[PDB]
Design a protein around this motif. Structure first.
Motif, PDB file in Angstrom:
ATOM      1  N   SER B  41     -41.346  20.802  49.055  1.00 54.00           N
ATOM      2  CA  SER B  41     -41.549  20.288  47.693  1.00 54.00           C
ATOM      3  C   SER B  41     -41.376  21.430  46.649  1.00 54.00           C
ATOM      4  N   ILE B  42     -41.876  22.617  46.978  1.00 59.09           N
ATOM      5  CA  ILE B  42     -41.684  23.815  46.112  1.00 59.09           C
ATOM      6  C   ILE B  42     -40.209  24.230  45.942  1.00 59.09           C
ATOM      7  N   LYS B  43     -39.435  24.227  47.044  1.00 61.68           N
ATOM      8  CA  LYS B  43     -37.952  24.381  46.967  1.00 61.68           C
ATOM      9  C   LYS B  43     -37.313  23.440  45.930  1.00 61.68           C
ATOM     10  N   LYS B  44     -37.725  22.180  45.940  1.00 63.84           N
ATOM     11  CA  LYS B  44     -37.193  21.180  44.991  1.00 63.84           C
ATOM     12  C   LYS B  44     -37.564  21.472  43.521  1.00 63.84           C
ATOM     13  N   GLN B  45     -38.760  22.011  43.306  1.00 67.50           N
ATOM     14  CA  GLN B  45     -39.254  22.237  41.942  1.00 67.50           C
ATOM     15  C   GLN B  45     -38.567  23.493  41.371  1.00 67.50           C
ATOM     16  N   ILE B  46     -38.177  24.425  42.253  1.00 70.17           N
ATOM     17  CA  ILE B  46     -37.586  25.688  41.823  1.00 70.17           C
ATOM     18  C   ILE B  46     -36.163  25.366  41.294  1.00 70.17           C
ATOM     19  N   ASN B  47     -35.412  24.638  42.119  1.00 70.81           N
ATOM     20  CA  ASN B  47     -34.122  24.047  41.755  1.00 70.81           C
ATOM     21  C   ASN B  47     -34.170  23.229  40.483  1.00 70.81           C
ATOM     22  N   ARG B  48     -35.158  22.376  40.368  1.00 72.29           N
ATOM     23  CA  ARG B  48     -35.317  21.612  39.130  1.00 72.29           C
ATOM     24  C   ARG B  48     -35.538  22.590  37.955  1.00 72.29           C
ATOM     25  N   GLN B  49     -36.242  23.682  38.245  1.00 74.55           N
ATOM     26  CA  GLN B  49     -36.601  24.638  37.220  1.00 74.55           C
ATOM     27  C   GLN B  49     -35.378  25.478  36.806  1.00 74.55           C
ATOM     28  N   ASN B  50     -34.595  25.935  37.788  1.00 75.12           N
ATOM     29  CA  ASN B  50     -33.311  26.637  37.525  1.00 75.12           C
ATOM     30  C   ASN B  50     -32.415  25.870  36.549  1.00 75.12           C
ATOM     31  N   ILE B  51     -32.230  24.574  36.824  1.00 78.20           N
ATOM     32  CA  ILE B  51     -31.432  23.676  35.993  1.00 78.20           C
ATOM     33  C   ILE B  51     -31.947  23.752  34.559  1.00 78.20           C
ATOM     34  N   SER B  52     -33.263  23.636  34.409  1.00 79.25           N
ATOM     35  CA  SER B  52     -33.889  23.603  33.097  1.00 79.25           C
ATOM     36  C   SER B  52     -33.704  24.913  32.311  1.00 79.25           C
TER      37      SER B  52
ATOM     38  N   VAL C  38     -51.093  27.655  48.438  1.00 73.79           N
ATOM     39  CA  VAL C  38     -49.757  27.112  48.287  1.00 73.79           C
ATOM     40  C   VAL C  38     -49.831  25.863  47.343  1.00 73.79           C
ATOM     41  N   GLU C  39     -50.934  25.122  47.435  1.00 75.78           N
ATOM     42  CA  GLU C  39     -51.217  24.002  46.513  1.00 75.78           C
ATOM     43  C   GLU C  39     -51.415  24.422  45.051  1.00 75.78           C
ATOM     44  N   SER C  40     -52.182  25.480  44.830  1.00 68.79           N
ATOM     45  CA  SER C  40     -52.307  26.099  43.521  1.00 68.79           C
ATOM     46  C   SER C  40     -50.923  26.511  42.976  1.00 68.79           C
ATOM     47  N   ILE C  41     -50.055  26.996  43.869  1.00 71.19           N
ATOM     48  CA  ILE C  41     -48.701  27.350  43.529  1.00 71.19           C
ATOM     49  C   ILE C  41     -47.897  26.143  43.137  1.00 71.19           C
ATOM     50  N   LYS C  42     -48.048  25.037  43.869  1.00 73.08           N
ATOM     51  CA  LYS C  42     -47.241  23.837  43.578  1.00 73.08           C
ATOM     52  C   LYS C  42     -47.615  23.338  42.152  1.00 73.08           C
ATOM     53  N   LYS C  43     -48.852  23.613  41.745  1.00 68.15           N
ATOM     54  CA  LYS C  43     -49.396  23.067  40.489  1.00 68.15           C
ATOM     55  C   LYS C  43     -48.940  23.933  39.340  1.00 68.15           C
ATOM     56  N   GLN C  44     -49.013  25.251  39.562  1.00 68.26           N
ATOM     57  CA  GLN C  44     -48.476  26.252  38.653  1.00 68.26           C
ATOM     58  C   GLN C  44     -47.016  25.947  38.273  1.00 68.26           C
ATOM     59  N   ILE C  45     -46.173  25.754  39.284  1.00 63.68           N
ATOM     60  CA  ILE C  45     -44.738  25.484  39.107  1.00 63.68           C
ATOM     61  C   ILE C  45     -44.455  24.230  38.258  1.00 63.68           C
ATOM     62  N   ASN C  46     -45.177  23.140  38.545  1.00 60.97           N
ATOM     63  CA  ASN C  46     -44.998  21.884  37.832  1.00 60.97           C
ATOM     64  C   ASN C  46     -45.390  22.120  36.385  1.00 60.97           C
ATOM     65  N   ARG C  47     -46.450  22.877  36.168  1.00 60.58           N
ATOM     66  CA  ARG C  47     -46.895  23.174  34.814  1.00 60.58           C
ATOM     67  C   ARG C  47     -45.850  24.029  34.033  1.00 60.58           C
ATOM     68  N   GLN C  48     -45.187  24.978  34.697  1.00 58.45           N
ATOM     69  CA  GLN C  48     -44.167  25.825  34.055  1.00 58.45           C
ATOM     70  C   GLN C  48     -42.930  25.003  33.657  1.00 58.45           C
ATOM     71  N   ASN C  49     -42.554  24.085  34.553  1.00 53.90           N
ATOM     72  CA  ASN C  49     -41.436  23.148  34.378  1.00 53.90           C
ATOM     73  C   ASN C  49     -41.606  22.260  33.166  1.00 53.90           C
ATOM     74  N   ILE C  50     -42.707  21.547  33.153  1.00 50.65           N
ATOM     75  CA  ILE C  50     -43.173  20.856  31.971  1.00 50.65           C
ATOM     76  C   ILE C  50     -43.015  21.738  30.714  1.00 50.65           C
ATOM     77  N   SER C  51     -43.670  22.890  30.673  1.00 50.49           N
ATOM     78  CA  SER C  51     -43.486  23.864  29.538  1.00 50.49           C
ATOM     79  C   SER C  51     -42.045  24.180  29.070  1.00 50.49           C
ATOM     80  N   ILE C  52     -41.134  24.394  30.015  1.00 54.11           N
ATOM     81  CA  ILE C  52     -39.750  24.741  29.682  1.00 54.11           C
ATOM     82  C   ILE C  52     -39.148  23.571  28.938  1.00 54.11           C
TER      83      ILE C  52
END
Lengths: 65, 64, 62, 62
Positions: B41-52, C38-52
């Motif tokens: 799931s983290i691999k997918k979010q990183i890719n989504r993030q790169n695009i952004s 790793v869960e805290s990490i998954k949450k961090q990432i989603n939050r950064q994505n939203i921000s961008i």
């Protein structure tokens, strides 16, 4: 006698512990592959931080008009 | 023979302890193996993030 | 009896395997604390994505 | 005897599970490196957060 039955029970539990050790070893192997991917994730986020800095660089150019 | 019997019973007890070790170890590895899906799931979010970032890197030039 | 000494060695070797398994179990227990990381990490990432994305919206208005 | 050879079989099988343990030990040692990979990622996401706040700060100023 009952001694022979016992000695074959030791042999069979030893064979079963050996067989579970192989499955424990596979699961460890599969976790070690996942360590390779976590390593790549570490690397991709560093590349993202390098990129955020480019953004910030161009954003500074905008702010000074 | 009473002594050998008792010793043989020790070996069998000792095997049952090791079998229980194996089971505790297998249980902790199966709980850890849940990380696999979290990492996918983290691999997918990183890719989504790169695009952004690229959508952003670009807008910051049509402006500039 | 060679047999007595053999049965004693067998006993000693098993008790050592079992003592070594205790250390393996505690170390594995200590890796399970990673599930929270790793869960805290998954949450961090989603939050950064939203921000961008939240940043792109602001850029459009400029 | 039938017995002596059986006890030899037990010693052989015991050596094997001692062998298994060495391999479980070495793999587990390698796996423990994961804690540091996860900690490094956490540091990297903290730095990213900071770098994003900067960017929003700049869009705020504009």
């Amino acid at each position: 006698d009952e001694l022979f039955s016992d000695v074959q029970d030791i042999k069979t539990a030893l064979a079963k512990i050996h067989e579970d050790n192989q499955k424990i070893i596979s699961k460890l192997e599969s976790l070690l592959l996942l360590k390779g991917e976590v390593e790549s994730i570490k690397k991709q986020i560093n590349r993202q931080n390098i990129s955020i800095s480019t953004l910030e660089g161009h954003l500074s150019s905008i702010m000074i008009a």
